[PDB]
């Protein structure tokens with residue numbers, strides 16, 4: 362009866378409902394290695410046939426832009442992940458691992474040998490934020506990527522995808538949003554390259570295209586999706602003509618024909634003509650609740666609805682949205698803290 366709870370076929374996976382657990386970086390993967398808590402954490406949010414997206418997970422030793430966010434690049438990371446995946450599968454969930462690389466959203470302390478964070482440009486991020494009595498910005502200014510190192514980075518993503526297929530994930534979500542490394546190449550206020558990877562919408566999207574192209578052939582197109590936020594400017598990631606990206610992108614992806622397009626809502630033409638344009642599954646996130654999502658589902662506005670903070674604080678959200686029940690509050694101060702339990706797995710189930 363409830364739209365959000367109506368089944369939906371995606372690529373070839375049977376979803377029991379459309380309430381998707383949004384990828385959520387929790388910074389509790391000590392040393393970049395997934396922890397035992399995640400096993401509980403993701404398991405608690407799994408439902409027979411529920412779709413789950415992992416927190417962003419580094420592809421390499423330079424992909425990070427924070428601390429303790431999991432990587433998917435060392436044999437070790439994989440074994441830490443493996444059991445987390447089994448617990449999700451033993452409960453029936455379709456579990457995708459989002460894959461990123463922060464790009465210019467990092468610092469020397471994050472990079473090995475203290476090297477500088479890398480990006481499509483040498484454009485500094487948040488210059489007003491300085492340390493203590495120094496000049497060294499919070500975000501170590503980015504080194505403009507040698508155009509010879511770019512095809513390799515594109516290979517870093519294809520690899521992590523293959524590794525996902527090794528840890529047993531059903532596929533991967535390419536992080537193409539939120540001021541991260543891929544969004545940087547796409548955004549004009551950030552991408553000012555004068556070679557083949559910048560200087561125009563064409564050259565700018567070349568990066569994410571080579572990714573949607575490589576990952577797809579690697580693990581199959583119908584198992585690959587990508588997340589984009591053409592309206593957001595998180596981490597000074599605004600584009601001079603964002604409204605256009607949504608559409609363009611929506612169409613540019615059909616060409617490569619992949620599993621789904623996952624887009625974040627704007628500060629409110631936006632996502633309607635987007636799901637209309639994309640031939641495959643369309644997932645909505647950013648602003649949803651009950652009706653918000655129900656409306657988007659029933660009125661054919663979206664195929665799925667990914668919840669972030671509301672799913673973080675309610676292991677049993679899909680059932681609620683089915684069994685008319687209110688929700689618990691999310692604890693902001695602990696979303697990013699590092700306790701294995703507190704604010705991570707102590708959010709209670711209904712009854």
Ligand SMILES: Cc1cc2nc3c(=O)[nH]c(=O)nc-3n(C[C@H](O)[C@H](O)[C@H](O)COP(=O)(O)O)c2cc1C
Nearest residue numbers: 383384385386416417646647648649668669670696
């Ligand atoms: C603690 C936290 C971590 C997040 N981590 C990620 C992430 O790793 N990748 C991503 O694409 N989005 C991430 N997001 C954003 C969620 O995917 C997004 O908040 C959610 O879909 C927004 O729901 P709200 O605006 O609709 O109500 C994160 C959000 C929060 C609060």
